[PDB]
Amino acid sequence: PQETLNGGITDMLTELANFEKNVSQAIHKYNAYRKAASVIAKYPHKIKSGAEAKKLPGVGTKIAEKIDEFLATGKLRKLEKIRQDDTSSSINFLTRVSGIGPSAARKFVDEGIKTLEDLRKNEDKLNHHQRIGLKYFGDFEKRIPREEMLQMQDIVLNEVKKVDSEYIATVCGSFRRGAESSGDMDVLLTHPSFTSESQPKLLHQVVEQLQKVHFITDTLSKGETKFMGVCQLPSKNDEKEYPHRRIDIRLIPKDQYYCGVLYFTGSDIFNKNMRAHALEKGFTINEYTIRPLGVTGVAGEPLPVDSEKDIFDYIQWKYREPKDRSE
DNA sequence: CCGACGTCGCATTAGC
DNA sequence: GCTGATGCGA
DNA sequence: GTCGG
Ligand code: NA
Ligand code: NA
């Protein structure tokens, strides 16, 4: 299934989704439109009617209506109107700044702050996160080619090992699945000395090292288990600079690591099926552990996990490579 | 018909 | 000050 | 907004 097949419908729903999240502050309506957008995006025929589309899981009466209006007129009256609305369109746009959500965007627009120019005119009213989001607004919306991800991984793995050779790091996300580009870099970190029953600087030391070699350029948030920040590859001599990229690093206990690696490798749809599989085998998987039920439904103790495949073994499924984890 | 819809670490601010 | 709720991103 | 108990 291609773009031109139902792109006008999926773009319509995605737009509606964004206005729900950012303007109406209705997070569940936001997800509902997206779920409709997703299932339609995968549908292998040019939709002829709203009724045809309503058969799909996630498409109800209201979206079937909108599809019927779109097909007949090439537009949606409500979407046209809200696009044209200065207040709403500005609130929606401002949320594209990292750190500016629906609430902060509303306040800015309430007091006349509506554009990037206005934001740059009013730094004093931005928190640390939002200034960074403003500074790298364009960079953060770019894709990351796999070649650059590999170069970034080279640096991360190298420096992590230099701090302590007993560290274990894994770049997860769609990168580990072999996607040809990424939205960011998600790093999962662990150490033999850090377990569930179980220093307060295991993560700090790694962040500090990546900063010393000037890979990590900025910090959005930093605690004892989770770092969120900005990084950049070294300029390849006299050539143009690389865009700044978003990078997350999390420290996970050794006994929860591969459950963490499994979850943050994805995809969402794969994860959902593997948690459905799964319960029907009498197990419950979260991002941290896998646990047995339990005849009356009571969750028992977390089972020991020493690899990804270990989780598969518990639930009667053969191990599937991240390359094959789209669903 | 009416509640669920993912969950949580971190930054920031509320109320006291 | 401290205790907790909220916003945000993922 | 959609699903389902
Ligand atoms: Na449906
Ligand atoms: Na934002």
Side-chain angles (χ1 to χ4, degrees), chain A residues 53-60:
Chain A
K54 195 178 178 312
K55 298 156 169 241
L56 303 182
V59 179

Side-chain angles (χ1 to χ4, degrees), chain A residues 94-101:
Chain A
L94 281 198
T95 62
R96 288 164 60 180
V97 178
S98 185
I100 301 189

Side-chain angles (χ1 to χ4, degrees), chain A residues 206-223:
Chain A
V206 164
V207 175
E208 242 197 68
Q209 176 59 26
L210 291 167
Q211 286 177 310
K212 170 161 158 179
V213 293
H214 309 100
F215 176 65
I216 287 182
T217 70
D218 301 82
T219 299
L220 298 171
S221 54
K222 181 173 176 286

Side-chain angles (χ1 to χ4, degrees), chain A residues 37 42 51 90 122 157 173 176 178 186 231 235 267-268 281-282 323:
Chain A
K42 305 181 149 128
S90 298
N122 292 263
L157 294 195
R176 193 169 173 250
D186 194 10
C231 62
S235 202
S267 67
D268 305 336
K281 301 297 177 62
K323 197 135 130 222

Side-chain angles (χ1 to χ4, degrees), chain A residues 9-66:
Chain A
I9 294 172
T10 57
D11 288 340
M12 171 179 76
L13 298 177
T14 309
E15 273 198 89
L16 284 175
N18 292 336
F19 278 104
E20 292 290 350
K21 174 175 61 118
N22 308 323
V23 175
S24 294
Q25 293 175 221
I27 189 61
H28 301 119
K29 285 203 191 176
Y30 160 78
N31 285 320
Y33 276 118
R34 270 165 83 236
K35 191 194 163 184
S38 295
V39 75
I40 285 172
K42 305 181 149 128
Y43 185 73
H45 312 268
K46 205 199 182 184
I47 295 183
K48 291 211 192 77
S49 71
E52 170 184 357
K54 195 178 178 312
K55 298 156 169 241
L56 303 182
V59 179
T61 294
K62 300 288 276 300
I63 286 172
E65 274 191 55
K66 289 172 159 61

